[PDB]
Amino acid sequence: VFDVGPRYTNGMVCSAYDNVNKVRVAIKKISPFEHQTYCQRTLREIKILLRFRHENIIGINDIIRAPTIEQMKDVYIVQDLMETDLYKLLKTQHLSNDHICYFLYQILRGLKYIHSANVLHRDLKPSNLLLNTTCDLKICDFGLARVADPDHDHTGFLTEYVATRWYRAPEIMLNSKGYTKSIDIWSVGCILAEMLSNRPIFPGKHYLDQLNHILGILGSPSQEDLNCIINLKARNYLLSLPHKNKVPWNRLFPNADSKALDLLDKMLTFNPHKRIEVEQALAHPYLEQYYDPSDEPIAEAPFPKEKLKELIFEETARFQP
Numbered sequence: 001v002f003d004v005g006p007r008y009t010n011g012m013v014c015s016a017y018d019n020v021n022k023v024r025v026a027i028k029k030i031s032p033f034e035h036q037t038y039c040q041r042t043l044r045e046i047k048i049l050l051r052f053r054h055e056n057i058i059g060i061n062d063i064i065r066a067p068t069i070e071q072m073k074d075v076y077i078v079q080d081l082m083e084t085d086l087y088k089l090l091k092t093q094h095l096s097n098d099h100i101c102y103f104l105y106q107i108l109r110g111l112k113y114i115h116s117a118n119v120l121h122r123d124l125k126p127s128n129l130l131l132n133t134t135c136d137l138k139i140c141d142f143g144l145a146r147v148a149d150p151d152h153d154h155t156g157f158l159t160e161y162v163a164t165r166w167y168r169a170p171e172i173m174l175n176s177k178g179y180t181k182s183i184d185i186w187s188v189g190c191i192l193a194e195m196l197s198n199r200p201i202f203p204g205k206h207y208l209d210q211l212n213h214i215l216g217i218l219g220s221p222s223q224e225d226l227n228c229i230i231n232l233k234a235r236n237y238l239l240s241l242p243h244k245n246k247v248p249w250n251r252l253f254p255n256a257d258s259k260a261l262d263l264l265d266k267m268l269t270f271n272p273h274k275r276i277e278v279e280q281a282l283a284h285p286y287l288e289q290y291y292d293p294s295d296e297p298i299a300e301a302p303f304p305k306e307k308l309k310e311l312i313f314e315e316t317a318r319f320q321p
């Protein structure tokens, strides 16, 4: 059953012709009501995406559902048609330095807006960056997004985490809940590295292997950076490891633009406090062809299951005839 009224003709995803605006669209079927976690993430995404309005963030064009809570078993979310995503594109296409630069610009431009709303995406990765045939880029999937909460970021060593392993910042495995903006910049750095070589930079195979990969390239954290980790189990883990030297970025990425590698270095900084912020990244020389802060807008203001289905029903009311 993929039931999108008569408006759209010709969980599960599908393209479809929109008969009111005469353009094809994307439509995603969400059958979330059988699982609490599906419900929370569905509501969080809808609320965020309906509030956001930005060229580099996917919009919601329409939501299709039954006219009553009792009859509502699925929700269909209608979005702008985007041919592909950066995951699919990297599996077959070499990117020119110009394409890398432009994609990175648009990721950071979109992220500036998200962070300006005090929201963290928390699962940036190539498959969450949609592209069209003219290489317009739009960030999607806000199912794991949270309002930033730096005063409650601390946690113990080896705390389980939900977001995609290969794009997790080192501190997630050590002492962080992923409640600060620096979590997203690490993921962007991973994406930049992946654009440079078409391969994930830190493809860990399980939770602690991810930190092994990171330390294998950045090398051992400095004394200063360790002194910032008060958590004893995390600190002592790091002190137990043999000394590892930094792998120079220009050896890992011999064809890369030197300015790209300087910015990469700043996004993939071990210590999240020293990590570059989104606005500094936009102002970096690598992006000087595009940087224009007047044209990098910010958000106008900061942003059980039975009540969750009611909340989703209420949140989707404005699209009803």
Ligand SMILES: *CCC(=O)NCc1nn(C)c2ccccc12
Pocket (backbone or CB within 6 Å): 013, 026, 028, 058, 079, 080, 081, 082, 083, 084, 085, 127, 128, 129, 130, 139, 140, 141
């Ligand atoms: C954020 C991940 C996601 O929703 N991917 C599914 C998807 N694939 N295309 C080509 C899309 C276009 C518009 C919206 C969602 C799309």
